[model samples]
Target: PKFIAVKLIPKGPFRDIPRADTLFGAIGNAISAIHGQSAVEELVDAFVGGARISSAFPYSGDTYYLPKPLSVEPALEGDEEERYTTAKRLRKAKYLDLKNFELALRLRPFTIPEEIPYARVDVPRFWEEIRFREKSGVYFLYSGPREVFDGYIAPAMRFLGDLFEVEFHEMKIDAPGSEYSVTLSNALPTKTPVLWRLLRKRMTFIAEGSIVKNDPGGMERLELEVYVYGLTFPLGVELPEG
Candidate 1:
């Protein structure tokens, strides 16, 4: 399976702070502090669809933040035996690997623009061009050192979503776990310039932060991997041959 590992490093000593508050509060506070409170209020209303504080912050560090816990068991005591028997009979078979499975991880930077110039554009054009370009297809598995998932990924995703209608499904996994995978297929095939434009705009904003210098000190990084039955790219590129 191919893997995309996202490694997020915070901007300062506050890296250990859970992303829940940082993304929703700190970011908003910073923006309001820099700009005017009225501007922030209006921006929040326009972008967030309301003026209320986001729930995304308080629950960032919580393991159960995403898919909620089940309050009741699905199988009853007498039904357990029948359920297991039926499940065993219907269990899918696994495919064999003739060749040894290999794995490799990769990292890239995530950036967002300070502003979206096309906010005034028509809804259909914005969705077709901007929103589709910024869509997140990969499964964003949150696993990293120092709760980086919350401190970095969550805020970044929220920021992007506020600026553009970017979407991605999130899942949590225990460490030392085996491989998992996701697929990315672009929906707007005709809008090739959209993705490039979005990235370019975002990179411009990221440059304002301390993270976007040409040197390693200013770089933000994301991690990814390749495994057996995983995705592959062109030749001459290093394969995650285990």
Candidate 2:
């Protein structure tokens, strides 16, 4: 197996965020810069099948946000029992409707090669394998951090499905939530939050086709933009051009 080596110098405030996870992203950039992209493009080949972290990775309540509750849970979602969920609300509402959706909690959790306890650290009680895998497209791994997805790779490449915009086009479910139709008058044009009535509810993923991706959104273009931003910071935002 081969591994890349790097020495990074993060930007102003990032130099001060003082957390462990950000270092991995910062280093990823330095590795590329020290190595020029083509050398690294030869390296970017590292992740496969467009593999990226889940948008709601480190999936937890903190990962998803909304100023107000959702009126209708998008037919698409995750298996909370598996401890994973989606950050994008299941709606076609414009970005305005989406703006108040997140102000995440910053509790850090185990990612990989970073905070992982390798060879049993010989330090303390922490003993976790820190594994990550990709089979068929879904990413399965254990990450414990608030800002898991944004820089897991780069913005869009972090969870490339980001390019798979969800446009509403008449999706139905065999058994939608019992109160899927309940009204919450307080919400702008709605009646009740998606699950307002069932204080306790049985949760499960919806049927086939209930959720699908629209892949032809020029993800290649977005991937480039994000990849560049990912590399920009570690080079120093204020350093004189060389």
Candidate 3:
């Protein structure tokens, strides 16, 4: 089976709290952001929005095969002075099977200084790797609100025959941590702006999987991460096509 994973991270503020409340707030905030409103909605919308489809897979089946590459060739050819060895070209092909695939989203919450330190000074590196991976994926996605959803004000909603539920609420003010650094100087003292960046960061994960036939209760996992900042969220989904 083949899979694709998408991850994301937002540029925003940070917070810490109990697991349950945190999850609740995260779900609430996510819904509000997507809908461009301040109220939470159904949980399933987070997966794919209001566009309903018959199946997660475009085609129905237990196994999915990736379209085969038509041909392989050298990326570059030798010039006049050098002996030419190979040529490059593109080919056409198709896919074969569909596996029992499932998509899952997860949200987790942790005190910035406790679980992850705020002193880490590298913004780009920190946002792309560690925070991105830890917050998103199968486990985090499927888990209910309270951990992943916090400080987000929105309406209450349900999904999967009430198996999943969500709520949104506003975040309270707290001291920012040391994860990020900020510099400010008064070119004009009267117009000095209070520029705030992420002092501590939070994240979420989006993941998918395929159940293996031979192995009991076994599956292969594909995942991506997201970083959150204020109410803005950015997703990074990049995987090699099979």
Task: For residues 83-163, write the lDDT of model 3, one tens digit per residue.
Answer: 242121111112222110111001111111112111223355335222212221111112124422232222222321122
User: Highest lDDT among the candidates is held by which one?
Assistant: 1
> lDDT per prediction?
0.23, 0.21, 0.21
Each candidate's clash count: 14, 9, 58
Per-model TM-score on C-alpha atoms: 0.22, 0.22, 0.17
Which residue runs of candidate 3 sit more than 4 Å off their true CA positions?
A: 1-13, 17-20, 29-41, 44-242
Off by over 4 Å in 2: 1-28, 48-50, 55-211, 214-242
lDDT of 2 at 235: 6
Q: What are the RMSD figures for all models against the true structure?
A: 19.5, 20.5, 22.2
Better of 1 and 2 by lDDT: 1
Q: How many clashes would you count in candidate 2?
A: 9
Runs of candidate 1 with Cα error greater than 4 angstroms are 1-7, 10-22, 47-65, 69-242
